[PDB]
Symmetry: none
Subunit: 96 residues, 4 copies
């Protein structure tokens, strides 16, 4: 027997908008090295793709941008990865 | 190209092999810790025949249930108690 | 590219870096039988000694550090063995 | 209660009369990552004996680059037999 796990993984499918991009901002970065997932959603822009989809929320943990893992990624590099992502993006996130 | 990769793996348990892999990890997990990894993959088993899962891969979820904060002991039970059809989210080098 | 019934044994020669150390992390349990080998590679840092050498990968099994066997060695003790190792390290590992 | 064990690489050459000059024991039903092969005897005057390192009780971990993880006693014998004349063993010792 064990304590029931609390969190879930979700796949969020978004399309970049010329005006919004993906319509969210991030906070954080790795501190503990290669396996550290330190990136979280800091805000979701009203009327943007993430908002309209409805799933992504401030506080959610960002695990991947399509297949690109954010494990061990700095804040700077995470910004880069999001910027360089194609128009069609699936975010793997964990949620409370 | 330095980033790791996130992949989804769909497996069906087999009578002899189960899912066809073993896991390792500690028992003390912080709420957001992901400490479950693959230690071996059985030749002939579903994981092997599927071809994606490898030793060293990091197990992130089982049928959408996150392994964040989940101990090795709890993860074994989750995998053993899982239905025949499982979708795994993993990270890979 | 499926798993082989026979695994592989490999020697890896690394030099510690002042910032990276050996450039990898390990995982394993704390309870070990005297002959158990429960230590495995969990990550390899891009640009670190292990990465540049190109042999060591996550999932590899750590068998010795400069002839010191990991048999019966707990995760906490293995970390200490890697920390206490000199600059020039020879690893014996097993690989899938 | 006993110090860390020691891993050694032993370089031997097969001999026409002695082979490698040692025998092994172990079970047949190994798990994937089990290492259940051990040295049982070392022949006086054969390669292993002359080399001086290998002793009965030692654990045999590999034959050249072939791991004995999950390898049965039967299969280990065949791995040793099939090996070329130049052989490197990885062993563990007390
Ligand atoms: Cl394996
Ligand atoms: Cl690392
Ligand atoms: Cl890695
Ligand atoms: Cl012994």
């Amino acid at each position: 027997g064990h304590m029931s796990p609390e969190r879930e993984i979700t796949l969020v499918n978004l399309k970049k908008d010329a005006k919004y991009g993906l319509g969210f901002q991030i906070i954080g970065g790795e501190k503990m090295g290669r396996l550290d997932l330190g990136i979280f959603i800091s805000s979701v822009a009203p009327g943007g793709p993430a908002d309209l989809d409805g799933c992504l929320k401030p506080g959610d943990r960002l695990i991947s941008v399509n297949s690109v893992s954010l494990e061990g990624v700095s804040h700077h590099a995470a910004i880069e990865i999001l910027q360089n992502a194609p128009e069609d993006v699936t975010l793997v996130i964990s949620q409370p």
